[PDB]
């Protein structure tokens, strides 16, 4: 509606018998291939990302936002436990880091 790309804001300009709009948009330029999976299995339960999608760089799996590549370690704070691993199709296996575990031990 405000030009090609993700709309951010726009600017008005006067014109003879009309108006001129300067639409500022967010358009990505570079991209990279990444192996994905809809969910992961930690201890038999299916973990789905609250915000984002699971990606893999060939050796480890990370979770990042859809529009930008910001890989983060998958934890229980970024994923919600729901269902079972049997009903999900294409599910993979990955260990979910728990931030509560090193605090109780230290």
């Amino acid at each position: 509606f405000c030009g090609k790309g993700y709309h951010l804001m726009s600017f008005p300009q006067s014109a003879p018998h009309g108006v001129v709009f300067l639409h500022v948009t967010y358009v990505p330029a570079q991209e990279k291939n990444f192996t994905t999976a809809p969910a992961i299995c930690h201890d038999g339960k299916a973990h789905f990302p609250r915000e984002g999608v699971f990606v893999s760089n060939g050796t480890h799996w990370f979770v990042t936002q859809r529009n930008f590549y910001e890989p983060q370690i998958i934890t229980t704070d970024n994923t919600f436990v729901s269902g079972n691993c049997d009903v999900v199709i294409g599910i993979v296996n990955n260990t979910v880091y728990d931030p509560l575990q090193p605090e109780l031990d230290s």
Binding site: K4, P28, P38, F48, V53, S82, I89
Partner: protein, 88 residues
Amino acid sequence: FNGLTVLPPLLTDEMIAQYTSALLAGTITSGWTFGAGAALQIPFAMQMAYRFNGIGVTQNVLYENQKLIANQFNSAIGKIQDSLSSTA
């Protein structure tokens, strides 16, 4: 024939069908990313979770009922053939 001229359109019949085919491939293989920028590949089984997340439905509903949603969608597409042919 007696002063009337019917000019042919700029785009032919097969020209319109090729444009819709490009949009159909972009919507299925890339979702809404091809409209904003370049074509970003994404699985269709995972693209539907993005659409459910935009209407207030969590992604666990899609994966737990993937076979029911796929069967419901295939039956809905097939009903258009009978609805258009019988009801002119």
